[model samples]
Target chain A: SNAMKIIDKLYEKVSKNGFVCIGLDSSIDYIPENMKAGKSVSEALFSYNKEIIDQTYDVCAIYKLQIAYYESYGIEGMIAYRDTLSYLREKDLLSIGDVKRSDIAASAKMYAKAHFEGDFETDFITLNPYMGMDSIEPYEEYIEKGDKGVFVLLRTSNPGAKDFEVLPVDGEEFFYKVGDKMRELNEKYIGKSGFGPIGLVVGATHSEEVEKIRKRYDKMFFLIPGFGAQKADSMNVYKLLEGLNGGVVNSSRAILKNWQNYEDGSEKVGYYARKKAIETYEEIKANEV
Target chain B: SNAMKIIDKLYEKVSKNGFVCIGLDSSIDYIPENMKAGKSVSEALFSYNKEIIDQTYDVCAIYKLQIAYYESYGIEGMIAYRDTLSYLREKDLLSIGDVKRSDIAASAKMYAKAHFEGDFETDFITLNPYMGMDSIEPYEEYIEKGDKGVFVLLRTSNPGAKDFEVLPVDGEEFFYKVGDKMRELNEKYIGKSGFGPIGLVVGATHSEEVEKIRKRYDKMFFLIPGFGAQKADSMNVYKLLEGLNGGVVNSSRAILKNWQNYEDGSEKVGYYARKKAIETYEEIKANEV
Candidate 1:
């Protein structure tokens, strides 16, 4: 009943079903031109999410909601986020809140409680590791709840990540040192399936580097972003997952906004979006197994 | 008309008036038993804030709303924070959103806009300077808006600040070097009033160090926290305010929860809180000059 075991089971289910996670990083401006939603930002976001979730729930294992998109709109966007998560939970699919929050102990505890307990709880949440051990320990209760996980940011795909993440620290680059530390922590807390409740957020775009990170921290799941819209090939992500066979490729705008360029009008937007997402999943699945 | 000028003027006024900022770090449990307005946490926070604002607005030039307290309760808490700022503004008090948000360029811009523009525009906000220049540059528009200011984290009061902030690099501790860089930045952007729109957060408890920091950054306003409840005495804070005379002393729990120990309850809470705060100010003024 450990979180690691739960995550392993979820991964097993996904592999069997050939499912990928569709990130619901919705924005008001990005909503389809003809969606009959109210003018309010929250309503538009929720309407768009409702359409996407209705179509993609059968194909996707989880719906990853990025906080940045919702956060940009303030409180209304947050309401949409809450509603979207509730809808996803109703469908029995896993929900991940990609918040990437990290702070001092008392604040961290409050964040953990806010996101992983009460009405705001999700299946997993992204975390930043800059504040050291005390910042992370508060989320251990989520892991104890048996189906939640924390994905610590390790090697991001951003151009500016090299500025601080790869800085020389103790002879090696800082991120390499971080990977070693994560591996140590994962080894200590790993469940019987050899996976740990704590995971890493690695970039799929860095395919060559992914293999090195994979080898270093084999027992951890990777919430691999930077696929599709970011132009990182799904084949590269498939290659990175060859050894461990435990990772989730996240595509937000790529899948959600796939209907934008289609010749069909608003009526077909959700249909095309779902079809395109299925196509992307099949492409990644073909490269696996 | 610039944010720096406004803040400089405000700091000058507050310093001249011997008023300290009362940090509205209100928690549900911290609210007096009789002050509890509703069963929900958000309502309780709002109720506590309303009383605190009504009581302390006359004595404090600014009210620093730590975003973490509001964020802990999710969107509802955020709404409470928005309402609190509106209430403070209605009373003509300066609102400082102590969020300490730092992100990549685009996200940082959004954060700045969120806290200092549109409907949520506060008088000032705090930021973490770890991401370097470009991250801080996007906030200039907020300063240009004339009603807002930014206080950067130079040497925080937290004990763990030394972990990464003061790490020895090349030859000197990083923060000392950051102080030098901030001083130069302050000189470039600050006005003729011996203060800048850009302020530094130095601990009142670190009075001895403040003299060194003040010498290095003479023209910047210091947002001095860690007084009274944090055990930093008025005399120590008085020494820190030497020479520059443009800083705001912040006391959160000490002033806000001053009436908790008394038997008179909610009615007496705000009265006693303001009384103690005024006394602290008098003591500081007497000791310094």
Candidate 2:
């Protein structure tokens, strides 16, 4: 309840370039074999998560937790997810839930309660906007009251994004049309708190498209995903910055899998994550245009 | 685990007409004041839900539980939702999870596991198709394995659907172009397993749009929502039939709010819901155009 506006906190953390969000998409598949010793899957996962949070809490301003990875483990994973959020708040970090939830109006009201104000509440959440305004308005209500945040899916950083987003809608790109709606929402709900609460979720890999959208909406935040696993950590993401900072640039597999590249893995898991976080921080900071 | 294939069960219950799926978007506010006697909100919610299911499960082929209603109450509500799904299976009734979920490939894999096979698993769960094939593909794998089902959002029933779905894409309506992709997936996946596990979610309010898609996707099931609440539902829903029957048509508040409309609101909650369900069932059954 005491969380700062995600935008303001993110603004504070921007290293004159952009902030590197430590995306804790802690899939069980990626947990180091050594870390699994003498621990339940949930226990090991939470320990793995806590270590990364502890180590990189300073280097990364935002901790973007992917709910699906934890959700695959069931309720225990949900507990880990809840505990991770609690820990993030304990240290005053902006936690962006990358759940990308969407539903119709009546149902979305529950999802809004689950993620924004209930046990699942976070500073920000990634949302899918395909269901139109009602699906989005529920989350927007929270943004109005608490300065909670939402990153509506726009030009996603995936090859599949091309499958529907580029299907030529109204002469502009389909997602371009979708982005037009998002821009209206962002302008309407951006509020007086710094830059934004409702922003766009664009992939770093889609620089050309991102550049076009970025040029059009200059005040909105962009949760730029696809920094590493998708071969995206290029220099173009700097163009997405709005208030003296590029929006949070997220790298999931790149940082999480970095420890595997190291010879010794246990202590270095978080070490490598923090190390990766620092490296990404430096990269984004250097090019914070 | 004992649940039947929702589609097959739905087809069996169809009486030479359309089948009405009772969408339980039950908010705490709608529960009869007497039912809340001496019970916590979540406990009361589950009990309230059980009465309606007991009363109307036989009248309707499906019970669409919108996750948001349960989630808004916090963990207690989720408990109620979990228990409600279990109860639906016990009665041999189909339970469709009306969670219009969407995310990237990796994240969606988890969302699929969470809803289709995880703690919140159901016979069917609604999905959002904004991010393209990969988002839907994770759930499709389950359809192949467990014969589970999904209702991918193509043209939703809400008025906001006009925002982007109507954008011209590839020389036709944009969402129509999106449905082109959906039909391909349905044909590829619908392998003599009593129609494909993947179906399209169309709002009954958008019958004209449904008519267009039906010309191409007549073989696939359609989970039609927006009947009654969103100023929708009419004769055109007849055109959405597949095989020998029409897919499920959902009525949320129209049914959930039925009890309160009766003059004697006390003991007649479920009675009225059952009465309303029967009326809808007959109306839909006789009009299976």
Candidate 3:
């Protein structure tokens, strides 16, 4: 509904203005003194997110909300999560729920309904495919609802991810198998844009494998995490985006929590935060052009 | 700590009395028609649970709350869950939080803290080991705090579990590898009991594999599910319980929802529910003896 239309507009704007998105994983402890306003954790998070959204809404294609930051506070955090997404919807900015949930068929269906149809509706959400096809089917209803999508965890930036994701499956690596499965799922939802609503979450930190994954799923959108604070190179991202037009590069700490590493510098926390957002946006634009 | 003490007492009772514990996954729809005293879903759930606890407190050692049922109704359901557990605690019954949570290290720690140390703490909780040791370490603090236990998913009861859990790892069955890993983790808390606070969820539905798993972790406690509704026979459980003194067999629906199937002309739902529970307890005890 509103989320889909907002994402459609955001996708068009980003395509015309240059495609880049910022991840808002605003930890309450990381908020700067200047933006505190003496508000509660929920209010502070909402206020901080509002400023970031106002500053970069035009420059960024989407805003990814990591559920962990809000979830840390328990039920209150969930309320904050709901409010932040509602604000994003009002701003006509595409919102991504970075909640990696997957289970058996029935449970998966409930998760899909909760996140995609209820008050917590999101444009796209992250999923782990370890549970196989039965878990993946529940999200199909989201795609049928138009413009909404799912991002299967193909490869992650974590050091420990290799422990199981890189294990051999048949003759190929497990991540490759995940990518193949994603491609199969993506094909089921191919639209007029030459890409499908279903996509793969390929970490930008894995510079070497991004291009390999790109070659395998040239027509699928990639929700790329691990940039800036994770030290993923912008030039390597250029190689990964060689043939893709619908990819979204994400930077969390590099943008929202940019205030953490602030020294007695010329700019304040908000300035640096906005500056990093612009820098992240420009870096991706330069790669595409 | 209190949670652990409850578990310890339950284990002692189970060992002394030769009875199997049943997890009351009491769904609102399954509560006996006669138990609907015009109360809301939460009230009915609490009423039905109180009766079950009052009637079978001596026959069963533990009552596991499948958190999903409470969560399905939102925060109100969670309140009822807390109320139900408090009632069980008043009866000196062991409580298990079958939340089955899995997340990154930081969030995992929060989950462990909330479910184990919060105002509504339970003796034991279920966990998903998809993220490996770091994800599990956060919960270990609970065990160290006194006696709170964590049951890691080794061989789940769900049919689709084989898609990933039973997959081969270096030519060895995946669950066996998990069992080996769990056994190693179990060693950290050994000499504390017949087994440690760390245990495995070896489903009774997989009867053929039970003996094998029992052999691998002879002293390890097993929280076995998939009895009653899933049709695990008494003989099957007898083989699984061969050498275990701390293991508990869980029958969720078959006891909590037994009012739906009772045919002895009982006007009260709790009456029939209690009867079926006693039957289940007797069957398991007879097989074990």
Output the number of the lDDT-best candidate: 2
What TM-score does model 1 achieve against the real structure? 0.84
TM-scores, all models, native as reference: 0.84, 0.89, 0.81
* Candidate 1 chain A, run of 10 with poorest lDDT: A1-10
Please report, as a residue range, the 10-residue window in candidate 3 chain A with the lowest summed lDDT.
A1-10
Error of 2 at B228 (Å): 2.2
lDDT of 1 at A205: 50
Per prediction, fnat is 0.15, 0.76, 0.09
Over the stretch B1-289, how does candidate 3's per-residue lDDT look in tens digits?
Answer: 3224434555676765445676766666766566666888768788877877877777666777766456555444555677888787677668888766655566666566567754457888877665456657778777765568888777765665655666666886666655676788777776434567787787665566777778888767777765543335665666667443567787776676666665642355556656776777667656554
Model 3 misplaced regions, further than 4 Å: A1-22, A32-45, A141-143, A204-206, A228-246, A260-272, A283-289, B1-10, B16-28, B31-59, B78-93, B119-121, B205-207, B228-238, B242-246, B262-271
Interface quality of candidate 1 as DockQ:
0.31
DockQ-sorted candidate list, best first: 2, 1, 3
lDDT of 2 by residue, B1-289 (tens): 2225545545566532337788887778888888888888778888888888888866777789887777677667767777788787777667888777777576787787787765677888888888888878777777866458788887766777777766666666677766778777777655433566678887665566667777677766788885652223555565676543648777778777888887896687788888888777556546554
Superposed on all Cα atoms, model 1 deviates from the true structure by an RMSD in Å of 3.9
Which of 1 and 3 is the better model by TM-score? 1
Residue by residue across A129-183, what tens digits does model 3's lDDT show? 6556666777787676576888877766555465556666576656676677678
Looking at candidate 3 chain B, the ten consecutive residues that score lowest on lDDT are B1-10
Interface RMSD of 2: 1.8
Candidate RMSDs in Å, in order, are 3.9, 3.5, 4.4
Off by over 4 Å in 1: A1-6, A13-20, A36-39, A176-184, A204-209, A225-245, A279-289, B1-6, B16-19, B37-43, B128-137, B152-163, B174-188, B198-249, B279-289
